Design an enzyme around this catalytic site. Structure first.
Site, PDB file in Angstrom:
ATOM      1  N   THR D   1       0.857  -1.215   0.000  1.00 17.03           N
ATOM      2  CA  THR D   1       0.000   0.000   0.000  1.00 17.03           C
ATOM      3  C   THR D   1       0.883   1.251   0.000  1.00 17.03           C
ATOM      4  OG1 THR D   1      -1.734  -1.172   1.162  1.00 17.03           O
ATOM      5  CG2 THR D   1      -1.825   1.252   1.252  1.00 17.03           C
ATOM      6  N   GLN D   2       0.610   2.193  -0.910  1.00 18.61           N
ATOM      7  CA  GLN D   2       1.193   3.561  -0.904  1.00 18.61           C
ATOM      8  C   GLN D   2       0.086   4.565  -1.251  1.00 18.61           C
ATOM      9  OE1 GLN D   2       0.749   1.948  -3.632  1.00 18.61           O
ATOM     10  NE2 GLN D   2       2.636   1.775  -4.840  1.00 18.61           N
ATOM     11  N   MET D 107      -0.994  -6.619  -2.302  1.00 17.31           N
ATOM     12  CA  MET D 107      -1.370  -5.362  -1.593  1.00 17.31           C
ATOM     13  C   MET D 107      -0.271  -4.310  -1.772  1.00 17.31           C
ATOM     14  SD  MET D 107      -4.339  -5.685  -0.347  1.00 17.31           S
ATOM     15  CE  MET D 107      -4.530  -4.467   0.955  1.00 17.31           C
TER      16      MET D 107
ATOM     17  N   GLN G   1      -6.456   4.400   2.656  1.00 19.09           N
ATOM     18  CA  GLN G   1      -5.695   3.136   2.430  1.00 19.09           C
ATOM     19  C   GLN G   1      -6.083   2.554   1.062  1.00 19.09           C
ATOM     20  OE1 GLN G   1      -5.796  -0.747   4.653  1.00 19.09           O
ATOM     21  NE2 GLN G   1      -4.376  -0.904   2.926  1.00 19.09           N
ATOM     22  N   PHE G   2      -5.295   1.602   0.551  1.00 18.50           N
ATOM     23  CA  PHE G   2      -5.565   0.881  -0.721  1.00 18.50           C
ATOM     24  C   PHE G   2      -6.618  -0.206  -0.472  1.00 18.50           C
ATOM     25  CE2 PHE G   2      -4.422  -2.851  -3.463  1.00 18.50           C
ATOM     26  CZ  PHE G   2      -4.969  -2.368  -4.628  1.00 18.50           C
TER      27      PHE G   2
END
Lengths: 210, 244, 204, 233, 240, 231, 222, 235, 195
Positions: D1-2, D107, G1-2
């Site tokens: 995740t970024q 992810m 968040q993703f």
């Protein structure tokens, strides 16, 4: 979901409803909440449908391997403990399972084990799971010296009692009789048709009009 | 590749013997004699240092008798360096047992563990075995005073009196002749020194060629004392028993 | 919730003239519930004394760990460990669990067998050494002990005077802490004799 | 995740009778700051494929290198690297689609929306979309970000269904794209006037147009707009 | 790790390391198993070359694997300890998972399985050990006696012997053991086991060990005097 | 002699004897023929029985819809290498939506075989493979040797008495290459080729194994009464 | 968040006849209030007379179908080109789904075909591989709009024989492929009117002993 | 010494060829495939009369539809049987069906050449794998330590194999009944066995579609031996 | 919540354990036995998280039974309690700790003295005349502080235990469906049928 298993003179009675809900939505009225692990062992579906199906089909595979290796029918105690030990490995990962493992062996007699996602394994004479609650329904007409015909009816009537009151229980009742020589299916009974016939013949559900 | 240079340290001979174990036992037969004698009221460990020098610092020297804990000691016959590796392992197991159960390790459990390590080197790993035989002198409240031996094979046995190293054949005959069951520590001390004095390949047995230890309930009341004898104390017991 | 105040209890150490004293309460609790009045928090490895306050499971574990390590030390060094050296071993051992520490307040007390010099030390839970000349305090009533010690303590007290000082410092500090008390033990340590005294105190 | 840092806005594209057109503006935005103006977001692969990329520019530069490495790798022990075994648009897309879905499944996505425009060996138009979720779809018109909301409606008035593609000339298709870029410049607070346009035609091959500007803009009507309701001056 | 293939095939289709392991067994002290009608007896030779031995603490030749199963062996003593440890762990592991103690056949099959594994694993030599595994299956009164050997083959025996001069004591058992009528009592079975060892042992003093296993975890080791009474009675009947 | 103990040892003349011994296992193997035109590629394999009660060992393995091989030598080694080709064909399809080029399949089999000839502990593959396929550059036939040498050919044969079939194909080269859009005639030429490698035994219904791939023909294997037409 | 999941909308319908099965889906692909495509096929021929749809997150749907198609190819390789029966396919798909139990394929899976007795079969799966054999299953956005209708018009639920006053249930008749397709088309026409994610096109795959055939019908594009 | 995976100058693996010599020393096992079922018979060959022969297990169940007979170093077979049972059950779990006999045999044979410097040597045991599936009906396979498996109408392995195989060559036809196959296995076992064949030193088994894999009772086999003796005395 | 009580009298140790198994609002069982025989003269009672309690108890049983077979000797209660404590002290700093609380009652045959050990899930161990885990400790402890005498007989201990249970039945909101009582003495472990 209503799943019932109890021990009597003639073996074990297994009674389940067939309703599956997603929120208020009734996804299915024709779910099979009894898993035929093998011809002598039965499992009940409660909590996660996939978790119950997958690991109780796996249990049947492990049971078959045991019988090839030891040339003996696996005991209900041993079959139940394979499943309980497996779910305990996964504890805290989010498996959802409340099941009754039912079998009749010469060594043990009729045996019911309640097996939990939390790692609980309990042997008992009667177990009932109603929509997120499990316990040892009506309990008023249950005696060890009961006929096979009467015991089948008691299980069928017990599921009807829950199906009427509980929003998440309904569809049909599936009946199984578990003997030393294996289990016998006692058919699929629509709760709609069962309710009216039970009401008329028993006199019960006076409050409901029909 | 590498296979060409492999001695194969863990194979049977056609007679069903372990080559490297048999050759390690040959090595140990040339090591200074160690004797253990178990009496009713304690154990004696007596061992011969191998052809010493006048310039060797004896009072700070240890090659034969080692402490494993306050209740268990070993006499070494073979490669001193190999023995120290095993001794340190045994010391750690003893403390692991004490930490786990809050009770001093029973003598046999310690002996069995060390013997099982030796066994492993003969069955897997393709390494040479430990060129070491141990006499274990110990006390616990189950069996009381116990003597054991282990050899490079990882086999161990219990004894009333035993020898390892050089001239064990001669040493065992002499012990078997003069040992009795009702014998006391002071008698056992005399037997051990008399046996070494007769079996030694040296001209005479002197204090500067010996290591000596006693495990006694000769500790004030219901407890056990280990005594690693000092050079002067070995010299005294040699005069007392009438060997010098 | 706070691991260092579940079980409760205190240790105090003081230096005197050619002597040291170390003292502890005897309480073990589950927060408000008192469970045991026989939980001694002072151990000894030869002539070196270690008090440990904090989470009781870690007190027991560290005692077993330092018995283990001082037993191996003695076998290899062929002599009993000294207070100065043991202090470094306690520090080393605590800091190796830097990011998963034992929830303890250890206190070392003893006399160096060679120099005869009285020695005390304290540690935080990750092994930082407090080497005070005067006194060391640890536990749920450390504030109360600091208060008592800072006023009651004077240097170069004789063993039987130091006993009264450390006793009165512990007792009065414990009586102002809910999670301390239920009895107390005091060790008066001299170069080659140690006296152990159980104190009479209120049992609430 | 970024989180995306330096970003590119809409990529727009459509099929016409003989090939595909794709366009994207040259801006690299740093939040509300319009930091970089000479950013090329249409990356040609051989003479039959153009990959239009929106979203994170650092991830775009990574994907640019993957495609450059793909061309090198394809040429290894390949006598027909410039013929029958040349990279197809379909091969280049499937590869990117594989990478995008793998990266989202670990992810750790490539924070991009990608349109692969090209013409296949048999002369078939290729136009397919893939994004940071590994989601893929094909349509006679494709657009990312704002383009999806404002460009698609305009482009779909030219090619509303598959049967409109043979009726659409390269002149009509290019006109529709250029107009859609002007509409995006009016209405997207993350657009620039400067854009690149690529045409992949089954006859005339790859035509890559750099330093194009939005022109024929309507602003004059602004002079007559005063206040926000009651004001007359 | 050391991966060298020590157990391999020779041109004549033999595995010499497995066959040389059997030679280690041949050198081992004699062990004998005899099952009666309602018992199994394990007799073991103690070579009298070692006196001044402490018999209290010296590893006994018969080991309990569980409360109802015992293992005796011929061959390398050190090797036997590794098989005994693994068997004891597996016996508790079986009780924990199956909620039932091991059958004698199951425990045999496990030990034999370990022995086999060590004949086609890299960097290991076979066990220089053969075992006699005796006992009673839970809630069963039928006597069980099995044999294992370095190769990993196992089988059930009415009576069997292993180790040095096992050829002689097997000769004795083959003519003296009737299958139609096995030793009816504990006495008869112990007597026949002592008799079989007296063919090979030398002196009937501290050279013979006898362990009697009965149904329902009833295991007892006979003392010197108890065995000495059997030795006395046998030779007094022989003087005729 | 002294230099044949393992694959990691060169002889004084720079030979690899273990690889040469692996090559020998192929010569002992039953004959298999490969030949192609511009439209189709054909495998023909003489299957070998243990005795009259036994089945005839299968020689031809399908690798994809457009590619497969025939084996001569250690069948288990063919299974390992064919499984590896199946995976590489499958990887190309899934990741790149692209049918693996037969030439690239050859390069992959070469590199896999090579690693087993330069490293200690391993052994060379004891099997030879004839790979046929139809890709974007038309029909292809490859010969694989477990030395790692892979060769693109119009036709070839491997196994016992393969030289007979190979000489025939070398004569017929100009004829069979021109058999375009006629699968039956190309197979006939393949059956006539393998017939030059027979002695004592002849082609029976459970003896003969034929495979074909081409322009509008997926890789399909013919066994039993499906090859009776060609006997 | 993703967020690794998305909703691509779409509605699918599986019906099992006596000697046939249909798997139908709308051809519209959406995110939020935008249309991605008006024709993005959602129902796939997987070979061995099996048709599949994994409706929900289109990325997870494409991945599962791709993996299952590959599973059929390898079943052929490993088991001498044995035909994969619909029951065996169903058990296989359970293992594919339950493999990602702790990071699920965000899809509702339906497969249609014939059983080994040649009778119509539909299997329905939850995201984590719970499955059941069913005669009727709608999945996706408009499932709640379609299933009540099918309960009424296929199983004849709450329908009785006129003049019996609810004493005789309307008897169940075997539905022809032509009558099933009418009910499918009317289900999607109705769903298109009342659900914003449903429209553009309807693609129906029909499975018989003769094989798989394809029918397409336009839906309203608003 | 020399590599375990070394090729001979003839192009054969030394260790595989040597393991085939170990199998020749094994007790005889015979299989006969018919359209009514597959029969599996073994010589028990007890090393002493005190060895309880019913504990000799050289015929083993893999699944309900697949039986297995062994010859050679029988201890080596246990892990092969374990793998075969696991493969059969695992496939049923994944695919809700019986695994094909060939696919099961192919799975067992994949272990064979997994040896080097994986296990230290090849298996020193051959297997006769008999079974039924819907696709290819009644099947008998010979699984060797080379990793090769042949299908057979009839096959003998072990010490008396080449003698037995020559006998099976003459006796086998496509119209054999199960009863005829049983007597034929008993006949050929009796011919190649050192000791006199009875129900205690020989064991029969069969696999039928209806009843699956069954090991014959000593009482059942004893009646077939008595039937054999009478029919041989009948001419 | 579960009741586990222990009282160590003159010549024995008595363990009282609640028979009820409740998950949420439903009672799964009324006959549950929260005890495992570790060795012939050592009994362990346990209360805590579902699954963990039985898994931990059975694991300890297996380990003590293994040690019994290997050495042909019975570990002292002190030794068994120290082993159990160390296992619990390991689990607190583990990925998923065992949430189990135990009472260990054993008769030491060497010392001819009964011993009771209380260990919580953290590995906190004490030797006490009487002990309890949970809410039950609060109610019971004050009663045992008054009546407990170290020279009490088994019958007196049972009466004091009987008094404790009656008090708990009154003051406790939960229905724990009575207790099972087991005595550990020189003759071994037996269950008191009458309670």
């Amino acid at each position: 979901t209503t799943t019932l298993a109890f021990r009597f003179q003639g073996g074990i009675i297994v009674a389940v409803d067939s309703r599956a809900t997603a929120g208020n939505w009734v996804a299915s009225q024709t779910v099979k909440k009894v898993i035929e692990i093998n011809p002598f062992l039965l499992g009940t579906m409660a909590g996660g449908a996939a978790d119950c199906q997958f690991w109780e089909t796996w249990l049947g595979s492990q049971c078959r391997l045991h019988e090839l290796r030891e040339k003996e029918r696996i005991s209900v105690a041993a079959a139940s403990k394979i499943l309980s030990n497996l779910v305990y490995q996964y504890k805290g990962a989010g498996l959802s399972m409340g099941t009754m493992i039912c079998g009749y062996t010469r060594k043990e007699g009729p045996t019911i084990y309640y097996v939990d996602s939390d790692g609980t394994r309990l042997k008992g004479d009667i177990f009932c799971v109603v929509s997120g609650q499990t316990f040892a329904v009506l309990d008023s007409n249950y005696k060890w010296d009961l006929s096979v015909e009467d015991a089948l009816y008691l299980g069928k009537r017990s599921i009807l009692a829950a199906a009427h009151r509980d929003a998440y229980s309904g569809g049909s009742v599936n009946l199984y009789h578990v003997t030393e020589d294996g289990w016998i299916y006692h058919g699929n009974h629509d709760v709609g048709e069962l309710f009216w016939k039970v009401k008329e013949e028993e006199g019960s559900f006076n409050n409901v009009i029909g | 590749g590498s296979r060409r240079y492999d001695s194969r340290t863990t194979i049977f001979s056609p007679e069903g013997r372990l080559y490297q174990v048999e050759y390690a036992l040959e090595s140990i037969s040339h090591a200074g004699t160690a004797i253990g004698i178990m009496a009713s009221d304690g154990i004696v460990l007596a061992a011969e240092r191998k052809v010493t020098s006048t310039l060797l610092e004896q009072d700070t020297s240890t090659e034969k008798l080692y402490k494993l804990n306050d209740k268990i000691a070993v006499a070494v016959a073979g490669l001193t360096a190999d023995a120290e590796i095993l001794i340190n392992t045994a010391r750690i197991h003893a403390q692991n047992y004490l930490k786990t159960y809050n009770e001093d390790i029973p003598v046999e459990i310690l002996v069995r563990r060390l013997s099982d390590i030796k066994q492993g080197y003969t069955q897997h790993g393709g390494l040479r075995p430990f060129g070491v035989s141990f006499i274990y002198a110990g006390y616990d409240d189950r069996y009381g005073y116990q003597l054991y031996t282990s050899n490079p094979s990882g086999n161990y046995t219990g004894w009333k009196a035993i020898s390892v190293g050089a001239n064990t054949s001669a040493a065992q005959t002499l012990l078997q002749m003069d040992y009795k069951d009702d014998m006391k520590v002071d008698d056992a001390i005399e037997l051990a020194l008399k046996t070494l004095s007769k079996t030694t390949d040296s001209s005479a047995l002197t204090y500067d060629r010996l290591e000596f230890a006693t495990i006694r309930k000769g500790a004030n009341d219901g407890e056990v004392y280990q005594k690693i004898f000092k050079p002067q104390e070995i010299k005294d017991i040699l005069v007392k028993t009438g060997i010098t | 919730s706070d691991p260092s105040s579940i079980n409760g209890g205190i240790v105090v150490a003081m230096t005197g003239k050619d002597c040291v004293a170390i003292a502890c309460d005897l309480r073990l609790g589950s927060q408000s519930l008192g469970v045991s009045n026989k939980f001694e928090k002072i151990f000894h490895y030869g002539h070196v004394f270690l008090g440990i306050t904090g989470l009781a499971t870690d007190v027991t574990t560290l005692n077993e760990m330092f018995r283990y390590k001082t037993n191996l030390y003695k076998l290899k060094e062929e002599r009993a460990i000294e207070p100065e050296t043991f202090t470094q071993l306690v520090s080393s051992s605590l800091y190796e669990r830097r990011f998963g520490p034992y929830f303890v307040g250890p206190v070392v007390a003893g006399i160096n067998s060679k120099s005869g010099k009285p020695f005390i030390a304290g540690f935080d839970l990750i092994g930082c050494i407090d080497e005070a000349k005067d006194f060391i305090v640890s536990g749920t009533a450390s504030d109360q002990l600091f208060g008592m010690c800072e006023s009651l303590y004077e240097p170069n007290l004789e063993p039987e005077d130091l006993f009264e000082t450390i006793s009165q410092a512990l007792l009065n500090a414990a009586d102002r802490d809910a999670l301390s008390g239920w009895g107390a033990v005091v060790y008066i340590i001299k170069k080659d004799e140690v006296v152990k005294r159980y104190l009479k105190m209120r049992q609430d | 995740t970024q989180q995306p840092i330096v970003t590119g806005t809409s990529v727009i594209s459509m099929k016409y009778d003989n090939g595909v057109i794709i366009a994207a503006d040259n801006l690299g935005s740093y939040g509300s700051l319009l930091r970089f103006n000479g950013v090329e977001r249409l990356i040609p692969v051989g003479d039959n494929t153009v990959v239009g990329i929106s979203g994170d520019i650092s991830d775009m530069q990574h994907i640019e290198r993957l495609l450059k490495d793909l061309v090198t790798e394809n040429a290894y022990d390949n006598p027909l690297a410039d013929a029958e075994e040349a990279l197809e648009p379909s091969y280049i897309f499937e590869y990117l689609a594989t990478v995008m879905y793998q990266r989202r499944s670990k992810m750790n996505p490539l924070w991009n929306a990608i349109i692969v425009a090209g013409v296949q060996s048999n002369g078939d138009q290729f136009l397919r979309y893939v994004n940071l979720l590994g989601v893929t779809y094909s349509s006679p018109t494709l657009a990312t970000g704002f383009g999806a909301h404002m460009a698609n409606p305009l482009l779909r008035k030219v090619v509303d269904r598959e049967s409109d593609i043979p009726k659409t000339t390269v002149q009509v298709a290019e006109e529709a794209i250029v107009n859609a870029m002007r509409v995006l410049y009016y209405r997207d607070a993350r657009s620039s006037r400067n854009f690149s346009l690529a045409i992949i035609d089954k006859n005339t091959g790859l035509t890559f147009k750099k330093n194009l500007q939005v022109e024929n803009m309507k602003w004059d009507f602004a002079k007559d707009i005063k206040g926000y309701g009651t004001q007359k001056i | 790790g050391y991966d060298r293939a020590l157990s391999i095939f020779s041109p004549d289709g033999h595995i010499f390391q497995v066959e040389y392991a059997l030679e280690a067994v041949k050198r081992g002290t004699c062990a004998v198993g005899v099952k009666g009608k309602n018992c199994v007896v394990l007799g073991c030779e103690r070579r009298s070359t070692l006196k001044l031995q402490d018999t209290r603490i010296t590893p006994s030749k018969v080991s309990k694997i569980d409360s109802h199963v015992v293992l005796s062996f011929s061959g390398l003593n050190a090797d036997s300890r590794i098989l005994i440890e693994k068997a004891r762990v597996e016996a508790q592991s079986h009780r924990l998972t199956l909620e039932d103690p091991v059958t004698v056949e199951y425990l045999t099959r496990y030990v034999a399985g370990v022995q086999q594994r060590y004949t086609q694993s890299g960097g290991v030599r076979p066990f220089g050990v053969s075992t006699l595994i005796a006992g009673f299956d839970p809630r069963d009164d039928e006597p069980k006696l099995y044999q294992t050997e370095p190769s990993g083959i196992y089988s059930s025996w009415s009576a069997q012997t292993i180790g040095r001069n096992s050829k002689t004591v097997r000769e004795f058992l083959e003519k003296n053991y009737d299958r139609k009528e096995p030793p009816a009592t504990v006495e008869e079975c112990v007597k026949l086991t002592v008799r079989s060892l007296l063919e090979v042992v030398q002196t009937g003093a501290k050279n013979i060990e006898i362990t009697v296993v009965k149904p329902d975890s009833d295991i007892v080791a006979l003392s010197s005097e108890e065995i000495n009474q059997y030795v006395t009675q046998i030779e007094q009947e022989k003087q005729e | 002699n002294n230099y044949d103990g393992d694959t990691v040892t060169f002889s004084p003349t720079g030979r690899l004897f273990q690889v040469e011994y692996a090559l020998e296992a192929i010569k002992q193997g039953s004959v298999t023929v490969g030949l192609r035109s511009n439209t189709h590629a054909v495998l023909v394999a003489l299957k070998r029985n243990a005795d009259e009660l036994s089945s005839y060992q299968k020689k031809i393995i399908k690798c994809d819809e457009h590619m497969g091989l025939s084996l001569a030598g250690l069948a288990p080694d063919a299974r390992v290498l064919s499984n590896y080709l199946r995976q590489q064909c499958n990887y190309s399809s899934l990741v790149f939506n692209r049918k693996l080029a037969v030439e690239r399949a050859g390069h992959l089999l070469c590199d896999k075989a090579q690693k087993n000839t330069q490293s200690y502990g391993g052994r060379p593959y004891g099997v030879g493979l004839l790979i046929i396929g139809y890709d974007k550059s038309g029909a292809h036939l490859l010969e694989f040797q477990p030395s790692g040498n892979v060769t693109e050919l119009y036709g070839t044969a491997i196994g016992a008495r393969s030289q007979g079939a190979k000489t025939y194909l070398e004569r017929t080269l100009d004829t069979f290459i021109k058999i375009d859009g006629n699968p039956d005639e190309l197979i006939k030429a393949g059956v006539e080729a393998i017939s030059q490698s027979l002695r004592d035994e002849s082609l029976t219904v459970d003896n003969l194994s034929i495979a074909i791939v081409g322009k509008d023909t997926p890789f399909t294997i013919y066994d039993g009464e499906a090859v009776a037409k060609y006997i | 968040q993703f967020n690794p999941y998305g909703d691509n909308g779409g509605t699918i319908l599986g019906i099992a006849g006596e000697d046939f099965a249909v798997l139908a889906g709308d051809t519209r692909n959406i995110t939020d209030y935008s249309i991605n495509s008006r024709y993005e096929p959602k129902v796939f021929d997987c070979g061995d007379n099996i048709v599949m749809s994994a409706n929900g997150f289109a990325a997870d749907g494409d991945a599962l179908v791709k993996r299952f198609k590959n599973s059929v190819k390898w079943y052929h390789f490993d088991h001498n080109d044995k035909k994969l029966s619909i029951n065996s396919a169903a058990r296989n798909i359970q293992h594919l789904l339950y493999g990602k139990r702790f990071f699920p394929y965000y899809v509702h899976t339906i497969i249609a075909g014939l059983d080994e007795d040649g009778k119509g079969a539909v299997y329905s799966f939850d995201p984590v591989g719970s499955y059941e054999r069913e005669q009727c299953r709608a999945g996706g956005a408009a499932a709640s709009l379609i299933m009540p209708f099918l309960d009424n018009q296929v199983n004849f639920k709450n329908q009785y024989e006129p003049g019996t006053n609810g004493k005789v249930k309307k008897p169940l008749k075997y539905l022809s492929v032509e009558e099933v397709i009418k009910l499918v088309r009317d289900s999607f026409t109705s769903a298109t009117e009342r659900h914003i994610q449903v429209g553009d096109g309807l693609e129906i795959l029909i499975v018989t002993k003769d094989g798989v055939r394809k029918e397409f019908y336009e839906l309203k594009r608003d | 010494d020399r590599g375990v995976s070394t090729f001979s100058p003839e192009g054969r693996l030394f260790q595989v060829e040597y393991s085939l010599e170990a199998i020749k020393l094994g007790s005889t096992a015979i299989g006969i495939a018919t359209k009514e079922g597959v029969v599996l018979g073994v010589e028990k060959r007890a090393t002493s009369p005190l060895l309880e022969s019913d504990s000799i297990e050289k015929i083993v169940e893999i699944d309900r539809h697949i039986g297995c007979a062994m010859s050679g170093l029988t201890a080596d077979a246990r892990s092969m049987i374990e793998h075969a049972r696991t493969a059969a059950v695992t496939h049923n779990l994944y695919y809700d069906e019986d695994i094909n006999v060939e696919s099961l045999t192919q799975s067992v044979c994949d272990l064979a050449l997994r040896f080097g410097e994986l296990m230290s040597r090849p298996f020193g045991v051959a297997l006769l794998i008999a079974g039924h599936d819907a696709d290819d009906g009644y099947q008998l396979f010979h699984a060797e330590p080379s990793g090769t498996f042949y299908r057979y109408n009839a096959k003998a392995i072990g010490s008396g194999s080449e003698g037995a195989q020559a006998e099976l060559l003459n006796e086998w036809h496509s119209s054999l009944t199960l009863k005829e196959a049983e007597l034929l296995v008993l006949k050929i076992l009796k011919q190649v066995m050192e000791e006199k064949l009875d129900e205690n030193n020989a064991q029969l088994s069969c696999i039928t579609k209806q009843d699956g894999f069954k090991i014959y009772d000593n009482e059942k086999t004893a009646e077939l031996i008595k039937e054999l003796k009478e029919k041989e005395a009948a001419e | 919540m579960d009741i586990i009580l222990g009282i160590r009298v003159q010549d024995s140790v008595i363990l009282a354990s609640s028979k009820a198994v409740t998950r949420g609002i439903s009672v799964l069982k009324d006959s549950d036995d929260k005890t495992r025989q570790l060795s012939p003269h050592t009994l362990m009672s346990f209360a805590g998280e579902a699954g963990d309690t039985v898994q931990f108890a059975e694991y300890i049983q297996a380990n003590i039974q293994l040690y019994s077979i290997r050495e042909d000797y019975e570990l002292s209660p002190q030794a068994v309690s120290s082993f159990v404590r160390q296992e619990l002290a390991k689990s607190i700093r583990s990925r998923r700790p065992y949430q189990v609380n135990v009472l260990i009652g054993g008769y030491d045959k060497k010392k001819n003295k009964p011993e009771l050990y209380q260990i919580d899930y953290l590995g906190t161990k004490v030797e006490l005349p009487y002990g309890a885990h949970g809410y039950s400790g609060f109610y019971t402890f004050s009663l045992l502080d008054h009546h407990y005498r170290p020279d009490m007989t088994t019958e007196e201990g049972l009466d004091l235990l009987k008094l404790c249970v009656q008090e708990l039945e009154k003051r406790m909101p939960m229905d724990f469906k009575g207790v099972i009582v087991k005595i550990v003495d020189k003759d071994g472990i037996r269950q008191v049928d009458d309670f």
